[PDB]
Write an enzyme that holds these catalytic residues in place. Structure first.
Site, PDB file in Angstrom:
ATOM      1  N   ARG A   1      -4.665  -1.954   3.866  1.00 51.70           N
ATOM      2  CA  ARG A   1      -5.014  -3.296   4.230  1.00 51.70           C
ATOM      3  C   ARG A   1      -6.249  -3.303   5.400  1.00 51.70           C
ATOM      4  NH1 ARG A   1       0.020  -2.919   4.579  1.00 51.70           N
ATOM      5  NH2 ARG A   1      -0.113  -2.683   6.952  1.00 51.70           N
TER       6      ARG A   1
ATOM      7  N   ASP B   1       4.745   2.415   6.401  1.00 49.32           N
ATOM      8  CA  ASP B   1       4.152   1.291   5.661  1.00 49.32           C
ATOM      9  C   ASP B   1       4.739   0.416   4.462  1.00 49.32           C
ATOM     10  OD1 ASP B   1       1.752  -0.674   5.784  1.00 49.32           O
ATOM     11  OD2 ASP B   1       0.843   0.585   4.265  1.00 49.32           O
ATOM     12  N   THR B   2       5.281   1.287   3.661  1.00 53.00           N
ATOM     13  CA  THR B   2       6.075   0.750   2.633  1.00 53.00           C
ATOM     14  C   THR B   2       7.194  -0.172   3.131  1.00 53.00           C
ATOM     15  OG1 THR B   2       6.307   2.540   2.089  1.00 53.00           O
ATOM     16  CG2 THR B   2       4.521   1.828   0.875  1.00 53.00           C
TER      17      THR B   2
ATOM     18  N   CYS C   1       7.894   7.705  -7.218  1.00 56.74           N
ATOM     19  CA  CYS C   1       8.065   7.918  -5.724  1.00 56.74           C
ATOM     20  C   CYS C   1       9.148   8.872  -5.233  1.00 56.74           C
ATOM     21  CB  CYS C   1       8.119   6.577  -5.000  1.00 56.74           C
ATOM     22  SG  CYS C   1       8.455   6.179  -3.297  1.00 56.74           S
ATOM     23  N   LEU C   2       8.864   9.523  -4.494  1.00 60.21           N
ATOM     24  CA  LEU C   2       9.927  10.842  -3.946  1.00 60.21           C
ATOM     25  C   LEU C   2      10.657   9.969  -3.009  1.00 60.21           C
ATOM     26  CD1 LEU C   2       7.316  13.628  -3.911  1.00 60.21           C
ATOM     27  CD2 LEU C   2       9.677  13.588  -5.122  1.00 60.21           C
ATOM     28  N   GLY C   3      10.257   9.095  -2.361  1.00 57.06           N
ATOM     29  CA  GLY C   3      10.750   8.179  -1.326  1.00 57.06           C
ATOM     30  C   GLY C   3      11.543   7.078  -1.623  1.00 57.06           C
TER      31      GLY C   3
HETATM   32  C1  HEM Z   1       9.632   0.230  -0.490  1.00 55.98           C
HETATM   33  C2  HEM Z   1       9.082   1.183  -0.083  1.00 55.98           C
HETATM   34  C3  HEM Z   1       8.080   2.237  -1.174  1.00 55.98           C
HETATM   35  C4  HEM Z   1       7.310   1.828  -2.199  1.00 55.98           C
HETATM   36  C5  HEM Z   1       7.364   0.441  -2.678  1.00 55.98           C
HETATM   37  C6  HEM Z   1       6.831   2.891  -2.546  1.00 55.98           C
HETATM   38  C7  HEM Z   1       6.002   2.855  -3.841  1.00 55.98           C
HETATM   39  C8  HEM Z   1       5.267   3.856  -4.358  1.00 55.98           C
HETATM   40  C9  HEM Z   1       4.426   4.134  -5.415  1.00 55.98           C
HETATM   41  C10 HEM Z   1       4.090   2.831  -6.168  1.00 55.98           C
HETATM   42  C11 HEM Z   1       4.164   5.415  -5.719  1.00 55.98           C
HETATM   43  C12 HEM Z   1       2.997   5.880  -6.667  1.00 55.98           C
HETATM   44  C13 HEM Z   1       1.655   5.719  -6.640  1.00 55.98           C
HETATM   45  C14 HEM Z   1       0.802   6.302  -7.611  1.00 55.98           C
HETATM   46  O1  HEM Z   1       1.439   6.599  -8.743  1.00 55.98           O
HETATM   47  O2  HEM Z   1      -0.262   6.476  -7.473  1.00 55.98           O
HETATM   48  C15 HEM Z   1       4.764   6.216  -4.600  1.00 55.98           C
HETATM   49  C16 HEM Z   1       4.511   7.344  -4.408  1.00 55.98           C
HETATM   50  C17 HEM Z   1       5.027   8.405  -3.434  1.00 55.98           C
HETATM   51  N1  HEM Z   1       5.753   7.574  -2.333  1.00 55.98           N
HETATM   52 FE1  HEM Z   1       6.735   5.919  -2.346  1.00 55.98          FE
HETATM   53  N2  HEM Z   1       6.905   4.084  -1.830  1.00 55.98           N
HETATM   54  C18 HEM Z   1       7.989   3.714  -0.712  1.00 55.98           C
HETATM   55  C19 HEM Z   1       8.423   4.457  -0.014  1.00 55.98           C
HETATM   56  C20 HEM Z   1       8.197   5.385   0.477  1.00 55.98           C
HETATM   57  C21 HEM Z   1       8.778   6.617   1.352  1.00 55.98           C
HETATM   58  C22 HEM Z   1      10.129   5.885   2.263  1.00 55.98           C
HETATM   59  C23 HEM Z   1       8.209   7.650   1.412  1.00 55.98           C
HETATM   60  C24 HEM Z   1       8.745   9.131   2.157  1.00 55.98           C
HETATM   61  C25 HEM Z   1       7.523   9.478   3.000  1.00 55.98           C
HETATM   62  C26 HEM Z   1       7.443   7.734   0.131  1.00 55.98           C
HETATM   63  C27 HEM Z   1       6.530   8.728  -0.351  1.00 55.98           C
HETATM   64  C28 HEM Z   1       5.888   8.837  -1.527  1.00 55.98           C
HETATM   65  C29 HEM Z   1       5.329  10.242  -2.046  1.00 55.98           C
HETATM   66  C30 HEM Z   1       5.601  11.387  -1.269  1.00 55.98           C
HETATM   67  C31 HEM Z   1       4.859   9.724  -3.290  1.00 55.98           C
HETATM   68  C32 HEM Z   1       4.131  10.625  -4.374  1.00 55.98           C
HETATM   69  C33 HEM Z   1       4.576  11.318  -5.457  1.00 55.98           C
HETATM   70  C34 HEM Z   1       4.069  12.186  -6.419  1.00 55.98           C
HETATM   71  O3  HEM Z   1       2.528  11.988  -5.966  1.00 55.98           O
HETATM   72  O4  HEM Z   1       4.529  12.900  -6.880  1.00 55.98           O
HETATM   73  N3  HEM Z   1       7.322   6.474  -0.485  1.00 55.98           N
HETATM   74  N4  HEM Z   1       5.291   5.353  -3.756  1.00 55.98           N
HETATM   75  C1  LIG Z   2       2.156   4.190  -2.330  1.00 55.59           C
HETATM   76  C2  LIG Z   2       1.350   5.642  -2.753  1.00 55.59           C
HETATM   77  C3  LIG Z   2       0.345   5.799  -1.833  1.00 55.59           C
HETATM   78  C4  LIG Z   2       0.097   5.098  -0.681  1.00 55.59           C
HETATM   79  C5  LIG Z   2      -1.079   5.473   0.500  1.00 55.59           C
HETATM   80  N1  LIG Z   2      -1.314   4.790   1.633  1.00 55.59           N
HETATM   81  C6  LIG Z   2      -2.250   5.396   2.170  1.00 55.59           C
HETATM   82  C7  LIG Z   2      -2.673   6.270   1.665  1.00 55.59           C
HETATM   83  N2  LIG Z   2      -1.542   6.306   0.171  1.00 55.59           N
HETATM   84  C8  LIG Z   2       0.778   3.820  -0.534  1.00 55.59           C
HETATM   85  C9  LIG Z   2       1.905   3.488  -1.545  1.00 55.59           C
END
Ligand code: HEM
Ligand SMILES: c1ccc(-c2ncc[nH]2)cc1
Length: 405
Positions: free
Chosen positions: A177, A242-243, A348-350
């Site tokens: 943002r 952030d998420t 998402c792994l998280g």
């Molecule tokens: C409400 C919470 C969250 C939302 C809405 C969210 C959303 C997302 C989305 C939409 C993506 C895919 C982006 C793409 O395809 O370019 C993503 C990927 C990812 N998120 Fe989550 N995220 C959340 C929480 C978290 C948490 C708690 C973690 C752990 C630190 C995290 C770590 C990751 C990682 C490591 C990936 C990459 C996976 C890959 O590239 O194979 N996220 N997330």
């Molecule tokens: C989902 C996946 C990637 C991100 C992110 N935020 C800053 C850099 N990458 C945020 C949400």
């Protein structure tokens, strides 16, 4: 600030949406984005803001574009271009089959098994932060819980100092943002000056924290390089600092306004898991995209190699073709269809971590403070970008109505 229309773009496909400052912001952020799904809007549009890019507006197309890594590459996943270009996070800036080895590693650190282990701390921190808030009859949910909760569990995971929070939090905020205060590359660099030393230290003298595990891991039978670790860890940080934080405030803002929703959860706790998915659908908040690797015709539109397209994860479950009465929150919907955590190879792994933090917070809060509302004369402001958020969330309640545990 609209960019002159490229030659291949049919003028009837223009719809000038500003992902960073949509028009209806005041009515809510999801509401602001949903304008893209009104009847007057074609399914795939071209916007001239943020340098010109495509936006898929429908569940069907977003999923498809996400599945198709051959055409739609994660190489440049952020808009504007300069930002997608400077983006080098792992596994997020990579496509299968390369992506797969790094994901396997990150999975080690944040997977189901790690959440399973951290449960009692999650539950412990929630109860603590809540009970401390309870007798005050007032907070800033955003600053008082939404931020501390998730951040401290992450600091714990990573083995990083709570003191670092503010700095890390500001750099994350600039990525997602943008303020104008810092370009994406500068923000990226600073997060990186921060990590490098820490990574060095953990290559040498490993702990059991996520960083030590990433820093000393194996990728394709060989040891990960330093740059590779720096780049995975950078994602892990921003990833969740952030998420979760923003998701909680959206959900809490809704709960503060809907007494019958809170009650439902109080009387029939078996419904929390279901309510959680429904909130994930309704308050979905991420928007990123892909780059075209070549000329390709998609749903009848001509995409030129190099074009960027925004594939809003936010929009799939707000799409009426996918969910009847999409803006309505219903805990008993037969099928909650969303792509909140993404789609395709980058899912998402998280997610496991985030669902655990969501369910705990809801069960835990409702227990202690079942009756709360938005402070009188408070105006809640949403903000838009890659990750949308809530600025502040003033809540008020009568202590006499609480229940200490
Ligand atoms: C409400 C919470 C969250 C939302 C809405 C969210 C959303 C997302 C989305 C939409 C993506 C895919 C982006 C793409 O395809 O370019 C993503 C990927 C990812 N998120 Fe989550 N995220 C959340 C929480 C978290 C948490 C708690 C973690 C752990 C630190 C995290 C770590 C990751 C990682 C490591 C990936 C990459 C996976 C890959 O590239 O194979 N996220 N997330
Ligand atoms: C989902 C996946 C990637 C991100 C992110 N935020 C800053 C850099 N990458 C945020 C949400």
């Amino acid at each position: 600030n609209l960019a002159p229309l490229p030659p291949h773009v049919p003028e009837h496909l223009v719809f000038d949406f500003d992902m960073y400052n949509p028009s209806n912001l005041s009515a809510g952020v999801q509401e602001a984005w949903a304008v893209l799904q009104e009847s007057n809007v074609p399914d795939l549009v071209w916007t001239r803001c943020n340098g010109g890019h495509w936006i898929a507006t429908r569940g069907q197309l977003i999923r498809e574009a996400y599945e198709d890594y051959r055409h739609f590459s994660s190489e440049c996943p952020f808009i504007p271009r300069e930002a997608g270009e400077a983006y080098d996070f792992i596994p997020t800036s990579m496509d299968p089959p390369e992506q797969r080895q790094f994901r396997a590693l990150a999975n080690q650190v944040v997977g189901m098994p790690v959440v399973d282990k951290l449960e009692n701390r999650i539950q412990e921190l929630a109860c603590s932060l809540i009970e401390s808030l309870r007798p005050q009859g007032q907070c800033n949910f955003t600053e008082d819980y939404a931020e501390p909760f998730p951040i401290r569990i992450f600091m714990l995971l990573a083995g990083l100092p709570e003191e670092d929070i503010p700095h890390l939090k500001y750099l994350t905020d600039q990525m997602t943002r943008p303020d104008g205060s810092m370009t994406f590359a500068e923000a990226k660099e600073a997060l990186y000056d921060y990590l490098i030393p820490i990574i060095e230290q953990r290559r040498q003298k490993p702990g059991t924290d996520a960083i030590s595990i990433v820093a000393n891991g194996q990728v394709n039978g060989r040891p990960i390089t330093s740059d590779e670790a720096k780049r995975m860890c950078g994602l892990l940080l921003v990833g969740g600092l952030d998420t979760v934080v923003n998701f909680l405030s959206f959900s809490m803002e809704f709960l503060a306004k809907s007494p019958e929703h809170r009650q439902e959860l109080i009387e029939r706790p078996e419904r929390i898991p279901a309510a959680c998915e429904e909130l994930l659908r309704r308050f979905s908040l991420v928007a990123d995209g892909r780059i075209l690797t070549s000329d390709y015709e998609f749903h009848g539109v001509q995409l030129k190699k190099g074009d960027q397209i925004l594939l809003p994860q936010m929009l799939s479950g707000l799409d009426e073709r996918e969910n009847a009465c999409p803006m309505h929150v219903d805990f008993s919907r037969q099928k909650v269809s969303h792509t909140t955590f993404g789609h395709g190879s980058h899912l998402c792994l998280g997610q496991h971590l985030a669902r655990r933090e969501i369910i705990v917070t809801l069960k835990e809060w409702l227990t202690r403070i079942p009756d709360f509302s938005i402070a009188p004369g408070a105006q809640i402001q949403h903000k838009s970008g890659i990750v949308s958020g809530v600025q502040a969330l003033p809540l008020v309640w009568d202590p006499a109505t609480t229940k200490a545990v």
